[PDB]
Amino acid sequence: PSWPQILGRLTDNRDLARGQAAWAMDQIMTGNARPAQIAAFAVAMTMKAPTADEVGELAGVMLSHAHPLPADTVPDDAVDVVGTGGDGVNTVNLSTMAAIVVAAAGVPVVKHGNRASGGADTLEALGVRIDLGPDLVARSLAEVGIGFCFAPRFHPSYRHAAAVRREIGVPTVFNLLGPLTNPARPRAGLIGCAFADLAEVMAGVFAARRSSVLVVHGDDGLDELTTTTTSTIWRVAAGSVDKLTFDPAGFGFARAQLDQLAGGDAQANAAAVRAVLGGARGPVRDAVVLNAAGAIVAHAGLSWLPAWEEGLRRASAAIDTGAAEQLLARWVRFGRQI
Numbered sequence: 001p002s003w004p005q006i007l008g009r010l011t012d013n014r015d016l017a018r019g020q021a022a023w024a025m026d027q028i029m030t031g032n033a034r035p036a037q038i039a040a041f042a043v044a045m046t047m048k049a050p051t052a053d054e055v056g057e058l059a060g061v062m063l064s065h066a067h068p069l070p071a072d073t074v075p076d077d078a079v080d081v082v083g084t085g086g087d088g089v090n091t092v093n094l095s096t097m098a099a100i101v102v103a104a105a106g107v108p109v110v111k112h113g114n115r116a117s118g119g120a121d122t123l124e125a126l127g128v129r130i131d132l133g134p135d136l137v138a139r140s141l142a143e144v145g146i147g148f149c150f151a152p153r154f155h156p157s158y159r160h161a162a163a164v165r166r167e168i169g170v171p172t173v174f175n176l177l178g179p180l181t182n183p184a185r186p187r188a189g190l191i192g193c194a195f196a197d198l199a200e201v202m203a204g205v206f207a208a209r210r211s212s213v214l215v216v217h218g219d220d221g222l223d224e225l226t227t228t229t230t231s232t233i234w235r236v237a238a239g240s241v242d243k244l245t246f247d248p249a250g251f252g253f254a255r256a257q258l259d260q261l262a263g264g265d266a267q268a269n270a271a272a273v274r275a276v277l278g279g280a281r282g283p284v285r286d287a288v289v290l291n292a293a294g295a296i297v298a299h300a301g302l303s304w305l306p307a308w309e310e311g312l313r314r315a316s317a318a319i320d321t322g323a324a325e326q327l328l329a330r331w332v333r334f335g336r337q338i
């Protein structure tokens with residue numbers, strides 16, 4: 001295998017041969033790939049139109065190189081709530097807030113995340129330790145019900161890819177990898193995809209791993225279940241993908257305006273988390289509850305309408321009883337206690 005060969009095949013608009021994407025990603029992750037080669041590969045893959053097999057190869061290499069969590073520390077039914085980002089709309093950290101609420105409802109959550117105010121920035125501002133290694137994330141999950149895997153901490157060898165991603169700016173296939181590379185390897189997730197054309201490829205990757213996952217794209221372009229309009233959902237169950245249209249109004253949700261979901265810096269976004277967890281009613285709470293419920297449905301799938309009703313009931317109660325607010329406080333506390 002070589003760069004001229006792989007790049008030539010991609011510029012010929014041809015799907016890669018089995019193992020070629022893995023070879024490329026492994027060259028990238030081991031510091032053996034020049035910045036020019038990384039960029040060429042990222043772009044060529046993107047323009048060819050990556051397949052699930054290919055994206056699955058890239059993600060597997062990343063996971064091979066990632067720091068794992070200690071054996072037997074991650075529950076068999078752990079769930080992630082994470083999006084590709086890059087939806088061009090600046091929202092409150094819907095996934096992060098949903099994760100807190102899901103953990104509070106009793107579903108173990110191991111959230112993969114990163115800076116932008118991104119999930120990681122907002123958590124840091126809330127006083128949550130984002131920087132914890134495998135052992136301590138495992139303890140966090142055991143003692144709090146939620147662990148946060150900070151992408152840079154667990155994927156240090158991604159450094160060269162990350163630099164190139166910054167330099168070129170343009171979204172590429174690499175933008176799909178975060179939600180597919182949680183180092184704790186949870187089997188369930190609510191997975192946001194900004195890129196409508198690539199949501200199905202993401203779903204295909206999760207299906208190949210037999211995850212129970214909802215890949216979601218708001219029909220307003222949010223990488224979350226949206227409240228402003230309907231959402232497209234790629235439902236992954238039993239190793240196959242269903243595409244459907246999801247309408248929140250179907251559960252009594254009032255239509256919001258995207259401006260009402262808008263975020264700010266880490267301090268603003270942190271305030272918005274505190275507000276939701278303190279019971280503030282309105283658009284942000286509604287979107288958080290909806291996404292929390294979707295994550296619970298994905299968790300349920302590890303065994304539709306009944307699932308959503310129970311998910312919504314459970315998410316609402318976790319906030320209303322103060323369990324969500326208390327969980328965050330316990331999370332802050334856990335991290336201050338080293």
Ligand SMILES: O=P(O)(O)OC[C@H]1O[C@H](OP(=O)(O)OP(=O)(O)O)[C@H](O)[C@@H]1O
Nearest residue numbers: 082083085086093095096115116118119
């Ligand atoms: O949108 P960008 O800033 O360009 O970067 C992509 C973001 O995707 C993640 O959202 P995640 O679902 O993990 O958290 P959230 O929905 O709570 O923000 C995380 O915040 C990354 O920064």
Ligand SMILES: Cc1cc(C)c(N)c(C(=O)O)c1
Nearest residue numbers: 151152155156157158159162
């Ligand atoms: C996954 C990951 C890993 C490393 C080492 C990074 N620096 C970044 C980043 O800057 O976004 C992301």
Ligand SMILES: [Mg+2]
Nearest residue numbers: 082083095192
């Ligand atoms: Mg998100």
Ligand SMILES: [Mg+2]
Nearest residue numbers: 083085223224
């Ligand atoms: Mg988002």
